[PDB]
Structure formats: C-alpha cells, structure tokens
Nucleic acid binder design. Structure first.
Lengths: 120, 130, 30, 106, 168, 183, 196, 125
RNA sequence: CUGCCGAAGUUUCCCUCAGGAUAGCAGAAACUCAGAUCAGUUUUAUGAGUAUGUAAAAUGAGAGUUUCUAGUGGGCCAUUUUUGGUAAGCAGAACUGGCGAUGCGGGAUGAACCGAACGUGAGGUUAAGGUGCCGGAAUGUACGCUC
RNA sequence: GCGAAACCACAGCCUGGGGAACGGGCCAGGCAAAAUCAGCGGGGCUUGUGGCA
RNA sequence: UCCGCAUGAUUUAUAUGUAUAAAAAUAGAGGUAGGCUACUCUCCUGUAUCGUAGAAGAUGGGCGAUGGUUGAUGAAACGGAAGUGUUUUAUUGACUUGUCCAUGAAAUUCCAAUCUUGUGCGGAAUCGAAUCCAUUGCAUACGACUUUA
C-alpha cells in the first residue's frame, strides 16, 4: 500500500531539515536553546548494560547500532523576534553582530569568489 | 453659477437680473427662468428704478459677418473695456444707486448677496425649502 | 443539502407524481 | 474649498431590464438622498451627467461628458430612469453621475 | 376590506306563490356582487330556492352603530374541514363587527389554513356581560388595571451610525 | 397570557444586586455571583420582595420562571444556612482510603475494591470535604452553592463505580446518605 | 443613502446573511466596504445546528486530487466573504470587481480602528430575531472547526478597547469643556429662534 | 420599566397623517390596538395600533373610556401640554421642526451667528 | 432573393397490393340572390320521455356554388366518460383539445405546465410570475402558525 | 541528421439538474494564471414478521 | 540620485468638504456633586455635530480678542494587528470678517489645488549580482538540486 500522510512524494525543497515546530514556551522555566545542527559522520555499534526492569535482558549485555554525528559548536550571529498576529507569527525585526565570519557570508552568494564580498 | 442675484424686470422668456455690481460684481444680465431658484428671501423694492430700457435688442449681440471668427486678437478686442459702452455703466450705476438703500435697510442682505450658494454633505435639495 | 437525500425532485418525479395522483383520483371515481 | 458642488451625487445601477433581457435605451439611476417615488418627483426632468476621463485630449481638456435627462421614477425605493443621449457603456454600473439642479422648478 | 350587508330576497311571484315571503340575512362581503352571490348560495343550500326563480329586493350596507366603543363579539361558524363538517366558536374584542369578522377570517387562514370558500358564518353576537365571556385570553384582557410593556417594539438610510436604542 | 408572575420574599440576606441578569447575593455566610443571561425574563426588586415577571411568554419560556425562582432561593439558602451532604463509604473487604488536601477541596481515593489506581477528584469551587468522626467512614461536604456541592457529591460517587461486576452482589462504593444544611 | 469613499462596518451583532445581502448590494453599487470585527457575527439557529451546517461543508471535496476540491476556509472573515461571494455574480468581471471592493477582517486593525464604524439596522440581531431564539456566534463556530487564532484576536481586542476607552475619556473631557463654553456664549439664545 | 401601556398614558404618534401629534390612551381594545384621543381639535378620537405610536413618560389619571370632553378637561387640568414640552425630548423635536422650516436666507442667518458663536474658544490656561 | 396564400394526418368508400381515393383543407376560373342566404352560438315555442329534435327570435357575416388540382391520409400528450380488472400498476374503446408548421414572457434548466399567436421601431400599460442578493421590482403594511 | 500516417464539425476541469440520451456546449455551483519534460494509460422501487375460517 | 527650473504636460471608480475612532446591554445603559454608594439628570438613531460668507476666493482701512487659521518649519513624546499615523510643540512667514467700511469683477452680454511620469536642466555624490562555459555527487532520464571556482 503506502501511507497517505507522506504525499505528494516529491523532492524536498530544502537540504537542511526545517524545524516545523518548536517546544512550547513556558516562562516558569528559565532560558535555554531548543535545537542544534550537526553532520552525520556515520554509524557504529556499541555494547551496553541494559537497566530496564521487567525486560528479558535486565542487567544483561546487548549490542546497539549508534549513529555518530559531529557537531562543532554553533556560533550565534543574530537575534530575530516574531510577534503574535491574527494572521500568524510575523518576523518583526532582525539584529546581527559585527564580525560575521567568511563562513556565513558565503551563505549569501552563489559565487563567493567572483563577488566583491560586500555583504554586511 | 452659485451667485445670488436680484431680479429687476420680467422679460419675455428670461429674467433681466443682476447682483448689485458694487456688492458682488454681477452685471445686468438676461437669465432663462429654468436656471433660477426663486429664494424666499425678503423682497427688494424695484419701483424706484426704471426697467423699460432693458429690451431684448438692448441685450442682443452684434452681427457676425460670416460663420467663423476667432484668434486672440478677437480676444484683445471687446473685453470689459472697449466694446463695453459707458452708457451701460451709467445704467449699472443708476441701478446700484436705487437698490443699495434697500439692501442696506434690511440686515445681512448685502452680505447675503456677496456670498455664494453651494450644497453640503447631507443636504438634500428635494427637502430644502429655498 | 444537509439531508440524506435531494429535495429538488427530478423532472421524472415532477412528471409521474401528477399522473399517479390522477390515477388515484380515477380509482376513487371508479 | 467647499463653495462648489451645485449638483447632486448619484450612481448608475443597471439598464432597464428583465432578468434575461436588457434595454440600454434607459438607465436606472440611484439619486443619493432620494428614498421614495414621491421624492423622486422633484428630480424628475433634471439634467443628469456622466463625467469621465480619456487618453486623447480634445479641446486641451481631459474631461468628456455624456448628457442625459431624468425621465421617470422606477420603483418604490426612490430610483429614477434616465435617458442619456449616448447610452451609457455597461462598464459604468456603479459609476457616479451628477444631477444638475436645472431645469429648475423650485 | 370587508363590509357588512343586509340582503333581503325572495323568489319570483307566480300563481303558486303570489306573495313569497321576504328572506333577509346579514352577511359579510367585500363588495355588492359578492354579497348577492353569497346570498343566493346560502338560500339555495338552506331553503332550496333556485337562483333563477329568485330576485333581490333590498341590499343595504350597514355601518357600525358605535365604531368607538370597545366591544366583545362571539362568532359561531361552520368550518368546512377535511371531512367537510366541523363547528367552531371564537371570541374577539374590537370596535367594529366587520373588524371581528376580518380578524376571524385571518385567524381561520392561520390556525386552520382555511379559505373564504370553506367558512360559513352562522351568527355574530355582541356580548356585554363580563361573566358571559368564555375565552381565557379575552377575559384576562377585561381586568381593570391593564398594563404591559409595548410588545414587539421592533424599533431607507442604510448604515446607521450608532447602535439602536431598541428600548426606552 | 400577558403576565406570568412569581414572588420571592428575601430574608436578611444582605445584598441582592441584580445588574445585567447577574445576581451578587451576599449573606452572613458569604457571597455568590450567578448569571441569568440565558433566560430573558423581568426581575424587579421592590423592597422586601423580588418579582419575577414574564410578559407575553410561551409555555416553553414560562417554565423558566419557576426555575429562576428556585435557583435564587437556593443561593439565598446558601448564604444564610449553607448546604451539607453526608456520603457514607461502603467497603466489604478492601477499606476505602481517603486523603484530604487544600483544606478539603481535593480528595484522594485508594484501595477501592483492591484497585491501585489513585482516584483523585478536585472539588468544585466553594466545596469543602471533611471526614467526620461521630460516624465512621463517612464524609461531609460543606459549601455555599447547592449546585457545586451536589455535583461534587455526584462526581465522587461516579468515580468509584463497580465495573464488570454485579450491582446485585458487588454493591461496593460511595453513596450519598443525607442531604441537609449547616443549621 | 449618501456614499463615502470607504465604509467601515462594525460587524458585532449583525446576522451573517442579512449583513452579507446588504454588502452585496453596496458592492455592485460601486462602493468600497470594510467589514471589521467579523468574529462576533451571528447566525440564526442553535450552535450545534450550525456546527452541522459547516461540518457538511467540510464533506465536499473532489474525490480525485482533493487539492482540486473545494477549499473550506475557517476564519470568520473568510466565512463572511463566502456568504457575500455566493451573493455576487463572481463568474463575471463585474462580480469579480465587487469582491475586490470588499475587505473582511477579524477584529479592528490599526489602519481602521481610528475611523467611525457604522452598523446596518437591516441585519442587527436585536431588531430581527425574536427574544429567546437560539443563535451562534461565528467566532465561536470557527474556533471549533479549525480556526486557531481566536484567543490572540480576543487578546488584541482587549488591548484595543483599553486604548479606545482612554481616547474617549480624553475626548469627553475636551467635549464637556467646550460644551460649557458653548452654552456660556450669549449668542446661543439669540440664534435659538432658528432651532440651533 | 419606564413605558407601560396604561389607560391614561399620553403617546406620541409616529405614523399616519397625525405624525408628531400628542394623544392620550383612553382604552385598550386588545394586545395590538388601543383607543386614543387628544384635546387638539384637528385630531379625532380613533383606534390606533402600537407600531404607529411611541410611549411617553407622562401618565395622567383618567377614568376608563372617558368621552372627548372629559379627556380634554382632565388634560387641561393636569397640564399635560407644557409638561410634555418641559422635557428636553420635546424641545429637541420642536428644534427639529423649526430648523426644517428655515429658508436659504435664514440658513445664512444661522451661518453668521454660529460663526460668531464658534470664535469665542475661550478656555482657562 | 423577397413577397403572398397555406393544409393534412383522420375522413369518402374502394380494393390483389401498396395505395389510391374521396372528403377536408388550400386553392384556380364561371354564374346566381342584396337575401333568412348562412353559422363548431344562444334563446323561445313545440311534441316525445337539463338535455331531444323540428319550427321561429337573439347574434355575427354578403351569402352559393357546379367545374379541375396540388400536398396529407401519421402519432404523441392531457381531460372526460369506461368494461375487464389486482398487492400493485394494467388493458379497452369513444370524445375532446394541444402538438406537428410556433417563435416570445414565466416556472433555475426542459417536446407538452402558466400567460401569449410574431412586419421595422418609439413611448405607455399589463398577463403569467415575481420584488433579501445573484435579478428589473416593498429587508412593504397587517394578523396568525411553526424551532 | 533523416523523417511518416491514421485521424480531424469545433473543442477539451469537476458535482448536481435538464421528461429521453442525460451530454462536452444548456442551467446552478465548485472554480480558474503562460510554456513545458518524463511515466501510468484511467477516461421515491427496495428490507422483520404466510394463507383459510 | 536630487537640487532645480522646468518643459511639454501627463493625471485621477480623486472629486468637489477624500469632513467625525468609545464599550456593552436591548426585560437596559450613561452622566452630576458629597460621603460602597442613597438621590438628581440624560436615551426615544445622524434632518446630528464640526467646518462652511470673499476677483475659486483680489487690493486697503478702522474697531475689537491672544484668538482662529494655514504653507513651510527645528525639535520632543507615543502608535507593531496590516505600526498607513497621533500628539506635544516651540518657530518662521502668511492668512488674518469676530465687527463695520472702500476700491475691482462686466461684451465669458439666455445652459454647454494633487497626481505623477515626463523629458531634459546645470550643480552635487554614487562604484552591485546572477547564469552559461568549468567543477562537485550529499543529487541526477534531461532539466533541477548540493558544492567549488
């Protein structure tokens, strides 16, 4: 058959996976980040002691396949504020930093070499 | 259009009507009665001024001598100086002399004739009693 | 609609309702 | 500058018509401020006017005018019938017309 | 609107009946001709006298003797129902007998979906004694201290600027 | 019928403000704010009496006039006398364990029929639940509003219903015993 | 009776079809109309009845490629626009142009909350529906069939009313002052014979 | 409430040819019609409905079904007129009527005085 | 190309057959009486057991012919009768109109339903059906019923 | 690079209705944004309850 | 790109005064002073309120009020739901009917300001990207997509 929840079966219009939903904001909790961005390096397997009560291999060794993804520390380079509106969230303003490295300036051009490097 | 003027005499088809030229500056003119709203403003006496000298031929145009005449030279001529006879001002001033005492007698009248009539939002002419 | 059927009787029903009413009246006459 | 407007604002609604037929000979005018036929007797015979603007400039004047006359009241709600020398184009349904206070009878 | 007519009629004189008796009834019709037509139908159905053999001797419209005195009328009628046979009696309170009949006719067309055809008015009677009034709604109207808020006040100029008071 | 009437005599209940279908009935015991917008009836306050008036009302509309009278009388009773509901626990083998929190506005129920599900209920506002000592294993629900006290008594009873068993034999649960007032 | 360039209608307490019929006539008449506060529109019939009327609308969708099928807009402004559109000859160019002269918004946005809001007595619920008759609000009826902005619009309406009340208090303070000076002038009753 | 359909309440006719006139309810025929009369000569005693009247705030004692003479005598004695006109409601209506009769010249008279009235704009600093 | 006149479907019988006939209709040519000379009509009288006929008052019309000669000789729909009939329709005749040759307004749309029988236009007024919006026209007035 | 023919009134979205055959054109709606590439060929009956006296 | 004159004009579902912001109920709301308020008053739609008087709005004078009023300003505050603005302003230059006077209109002798391009003006300052070609392989029938350059 095939699930109908995953159509139109068409190529993703993006390469970096879009976070279509963020955790609910609660003011009782203080501040933290909610996401990150890594690179799938590959997978290996491990051996682990299994502390699950009632499981048939409680306190016994299993073998698990694990995915290793490398995540060099991300750099915060701006802040954006969305305002609640009857027509949905709307990006009100955006503020950046001073020193935007060449790594992120490349994101703004299809040809970084031929450009005059005039971003920001 | 929109001016208020005092009717001097009753012509064959038209009304020989003027605003006192010292008040608003509307000389003695023929006006067809279909383009006149007869206001109920207090009447101004007319027995003091003669009105027989205003005839249809008195107001009529000159000839034309052909079907077409134009150009700004035709505009620099006539004008309210040249083809305008001095006798007309003598008649115009005579009318003003004989009507200003009446208009001065009753209040707001010289000011009423100096003003102009115009409609406003929410003003419905079929209900307005002019 | 809002119903389980259509209120507009198709012209067949507008056709045969009246004649079957006529046959009913003829039956009472007989 | 409110010492002007010697006319009365109105709108063109449709042609005189039935549901499947139109007669562009006469046009249905809604004289704004008139809410019955006994009131529409006043404007009966006045000079209605449709003013529009074009591309070519004749007379060095950008405004063309189509003259017309109020002919008869049309219905209960104070609409009238008008006869314009040139039948108004069908693109002018809802366009604003002018109603001159003349030929005056008040 | 309806108007009340007294119609007096009789059959043609002949050797069989040299002096036929006058037959007068009061009946409500919108016009003269309807009154005569209803008269002939009534006399035919009741007494069995043919339309051709008869002729009208007097028709007179009757005005209300006191069109400003609030009165209570009781109306007996013979309704032609789905079975063609049904009797009724309704009470009304107004100032004119024609008004009660007109109100009765609209009442019939509403609560029984009746016609002018199916209604046959037997008798319209003025009732003056309060305790002789039967119906509940009219009796409660007769109390001395009547008072009630204006029922169903409900009140071109489209696009009014302020919310209506729709109250006092 | 033009006028259906219903009359109510107000005891020493202090404030009976009736602004906008809303009654703030305050007595010595407390204060209850109630809304009567759902009905469309006339409410007149003439000194020591309250007149409930319906002008030209149908029987469907008229039936509301007694209901409005009854609920206003109930809230008057609440601010004057209060409402008390005694529920008696019934346990055959497993005792029913009850814990009281927030001055008795939340009830915790344990060991019902041997079940280890923690049947917890939050009492409706203005309802206090207490365990009485004069009679063993029965509960007293105190409050100003009869509706909230009665519904809370109903909520507790329907929480502990026997399931898949017989009403004939497994007749275990919490039942309402007495329905009275504080004094 | 007299036209403006734009009319802003406060749609609180107006019936859906009764208001949409007047708006349909004014649009073809050639006038721009802005309908504000759509989420308080009223519809005759009790709420569950109308909830079924709209859940039947959700049932209409083309069986082939439902993206082709009918689009069941949930916002109260869009439900009102559906009423007006069905009351217009939208399959033409004059019907199409009538929609373009219609604005329907939920709540009163800042571009319009500083202008007068008129009402249509031919559609007001208090003058049409008999007392005791069940009715449902479109704003509630949308928040139960998918529209997910009810609370935020109510949140913004509360703030707007606070600002609008503060304005009115300031305007009343000024207006009572000039009224005191209005009556203070003596010429008032030397023109009183004219009714002013 | 404030407006009750009372025998003896004076009502303001809002429909018909007697629009604007002031009459008093003499009798209650039924739920939708009442009998009204006025001492004013032009207005005859007749039966009018309730969509064609508006209830006023004045209630004057008057026995059921009084004749025209008695109603006029009671109306004069209790001073119904000049009591109705004492209200600001009647004053607003009379102001509207006289403002309807103003001609063009009177409108310019209104023009001038209220411009004189406007320019006062004197407020404490 | 325009104009004008314009049916028929069932008759008169006849037939081996299809058909013709024959009418009818439409006509084409010749000739009477200004008539009781007629009528898809009514009325009166009259006999026989409202209808029946004959005769005559009303009513409208100019009313007759003999002669030859094209096209048609179907069917459908509904009404009224109507015997056999049965769960129930169904069948049988006779009659009537309408339709074929017919466009227009209305009933959302439609072979028959409701009005209306057509040269080119102007104006006025209506029929049927309608007057919330689509849609020209009262979100009219009054009295009720219905959730 | 070379290069056909069959076929062709005109065309090509869908639901219901249009006496029938209901259709692709009519009516009422849903709607409707150029140009294309490759696959797949899709195109008011009726019921839960027998017959005789 | 504007200063800037223009220069020809192009112009308006413009427009004819682009005049007006409480909130809620309609078997109810609102306003007044004094100490939760007793009491007084208002409603009955906008036919209302604001502006409105002039060679399409001229040139002067007197009287009277510190005003109205506009063009242009040099600044403060506030408005995020689509902030289409609101306000505080001091300023300048006007205008200056509140009131009373004088000049001028005419033979147009019975009706027929804002809007921007425009094209250039002679003076100012301004110094970007994308694709093909090539490359990558996370992608691929061809386009497209992810890289590099």
């Amino acid at each position: 058959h095939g699930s109908l929840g995953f159509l139109p079966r068409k190529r993703a219009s993006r390469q970096r996976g879009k976070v279509k939903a963020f955790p609910k904001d609660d003011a009782s909790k203080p501040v933290h980040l909610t996401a990150f961005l890594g690179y799938k390096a590959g997978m290996t397997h491990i051996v682990r002691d299994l502390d699950r009560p009632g499981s048939k291999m409680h306190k016994r060794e299993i073998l698990e396949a694990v995915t290793v993804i490398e995540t060099p520390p991300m750099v915060v380079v701006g802040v954006v504020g969305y305002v609640e509106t009857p027509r949905g969230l709307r990006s009100l303003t955006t503020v950046w930093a001073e020193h935007l490295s060449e790594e992120v300036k490349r994101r703004f051009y299809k040809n970084w070499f031929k450009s005059k490097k005039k971003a920001f | 259009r929109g001016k208020r003027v005092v009717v001097l005499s009753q012509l064959e088809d038209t009304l020989v009507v003027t605003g006192p030229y010292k008040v608003n500056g509307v000389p003695i003119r023929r006006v067809n009665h279909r383009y006149v709203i007869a206001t109920s403003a207090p009447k101004i006496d007319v027995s003091g001024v003669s009105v027989e000298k205003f005839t249809k031929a008195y107001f009529a145009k000159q000839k034309r001598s052909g079907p077409v005449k134009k150009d700004e030279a035709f505009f620099a001529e006539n004008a309210p100086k040249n083809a305008l006879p001095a006798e007309r001002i003598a008649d115009q001033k005579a009318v003003d002399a004989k009507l200003l005492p009446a208009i001065k007698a009753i209040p707001n009248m010289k000011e009423y004739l100096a003003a102009s009539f115009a409609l406003s939002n929410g003003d419905r002419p079929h209900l307005m009693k002019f | 609609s809002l119903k389980k059927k259509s209120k507009r009787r198709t012209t067949r029903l507008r056709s045969r309702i009246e004649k079957k009413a006529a046959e009913s009246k003829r039956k009472q006459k007989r | 500058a409110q010492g002007h407007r010697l006319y009365v604002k109105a709108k063109h609604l449709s042609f005189q018509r039935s549901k499947h037929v139109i007669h562009p000979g006469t046009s249905i005018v809604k004289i704004e401020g008139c809410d019955s036929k006994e009131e529409a007797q006043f404007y009966l015979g006045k000079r209605v006017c449709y003013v529009y603007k074009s591309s070519k400039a004749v007379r060095g004047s950008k405004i063309r005018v189509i003259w017309g006359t109020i002919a008869r009241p049309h219905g209960n709600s104070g609409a009238v019938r008008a006869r314009f020398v040139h039948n108004l184009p069908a693109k002018t349904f809802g366009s604003s017309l002018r109603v001159m206070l003349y030929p005056s009878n008040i | 609107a309806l108007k009340e007519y007294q119609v007096v009629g009789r059959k043609v004189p002949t050797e069989h009946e040299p002096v036929p008796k006058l037959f007068r009834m009061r009946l409500f019709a919108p016009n003269e001709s309807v009154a005569k037509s209803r008269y002939w139908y009534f006399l035919k159905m009741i007494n069995k006298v043919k339309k051709a053999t008869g002729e009208i001797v007097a028709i007179n419209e009757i005005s209300e003797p006191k069109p400003l005195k609030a009165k209570v009328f009781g109306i007996w009628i013979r309704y032609d129902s789905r079975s063609g046979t049904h009797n009724m009696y309704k009470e009304f309170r107004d100032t004119t007998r024609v008004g009660a009949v007109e109100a009765m006719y609209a009442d019939m067309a509403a609560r029984h979906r009746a016609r002018f055809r199916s209604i046959r008015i037997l008798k319209v009677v003025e009732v003056e004694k309060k305790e002789d009034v039967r119906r509940n709604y009219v009796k409660q109207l007769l109390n001395p201290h009547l008072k009630f808020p204006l029922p169903h006040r409900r009140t071109k100029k489209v696009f009014a600027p302020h919310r209506p008071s729709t109250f006092y | 019928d033009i006028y259906k009437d219903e009359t109510l005599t107000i005891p020493k209940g202090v404030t009976v403000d009736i602004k906008a279908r809303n009654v703030t009935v305050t007595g010595p015991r407390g204060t209850l704010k109630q809304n009567l917008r759902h009905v469309d009836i006339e409410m007149k306050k003439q000194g020591n009496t309250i007149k409930f008036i319906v002008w030209h009302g149908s029987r469907k509309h008229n039936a509301c006039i007694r209901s409005v009278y009854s609920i206003i009388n109930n809230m008057i009773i609440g601010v004057t006398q209060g409402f008390r509901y005694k529920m008696r626990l019934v346990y055959a083998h497993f005792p029913i364990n009850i814990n009281l929190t927030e001055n008795g506005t939340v009830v915790e129920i344990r060991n019902f029929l041997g079940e280890r599900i923690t049947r917890v209920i939050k009492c409706l506002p203005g309802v206090t639940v207490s365990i009485s000592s004069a009679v063993k294993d029965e509960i007293i629900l105190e409050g100003n509003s009869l509706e909230n006290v009665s519904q809370s008594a109903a909520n507790i009873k329907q929480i502990c219903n026997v399931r898949n068993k017989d009403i004939r034999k497994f007749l275990d649960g919490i039942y309402v015993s007495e329905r009275g007032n504080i004094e | 009776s007299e036209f403006q360039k734009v009319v802003v209608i406060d749609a609180k307490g107006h019936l859906l079809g009764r208001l949409a019929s007047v708006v349909a006539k004014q649009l073809l008449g050639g006038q721009k109309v802005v309908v504000v506060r759509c989420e308080e529109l009223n519809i005759s019939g009790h709420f569950f009845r109308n909830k079924l009327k709209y859940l039947a609308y959700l049932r209409k969708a083309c069986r082939y490629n439902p993206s082709r099928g009918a689009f069941h807009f949930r916002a109260p402004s869009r439900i009102f626009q559906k009423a007006v559109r069905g009351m217009l000859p939208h399959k033409t160019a004059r019907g199409q142009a009538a929609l373009e002269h219609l604005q329907a918004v939920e709540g009163i946005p800042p571009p319009f909350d500083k202008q007068k809001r008129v009402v249509v007595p031919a559609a007001l619920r208090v003058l049409r529906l008999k007392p005791g008759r069940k009715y449902c609000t479109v704003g509630r009826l949308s928040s139960e069939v998918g529209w997910k902005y009810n609370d935020i619009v109510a949140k913004l309406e509360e703030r707007r009313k606070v600002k609008s009340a503060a304005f009115y208090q300031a305007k009343l303070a000024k207006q009572k002052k000039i009224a005191s000076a209005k009556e203070a002038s003596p010429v008032n009753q030397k023109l009183s014979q004219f009714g002013y | 409430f404030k407006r009750y359909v009372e025998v003896g309440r004076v009502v303001l006719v809002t429909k018909g040819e007697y629009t604007g006139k002031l009459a008093v309810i003499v009798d209650i025929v039924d739920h939708k019609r009442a009998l009204i009369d006025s001492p004013c000569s032009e207005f005859p005693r007749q039966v009018i409905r309730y969509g064609s009247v508006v209830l006023t705030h004045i209630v004057m004692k008057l026995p059921r079904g009084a004749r025209s003479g008695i109603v006029a005598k009671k109306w004069k004695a209790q001073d119904v007129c000049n009591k109705w006109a004492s209200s600001a409601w009647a004053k607003k209506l009379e102001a509207k009527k006289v403002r309807s009769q103003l001609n063009d010249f009177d409108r310019f008279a209104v023009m001038r005085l209220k411009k004189q009235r406007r320019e006062q704009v004197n407020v404490a600093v």
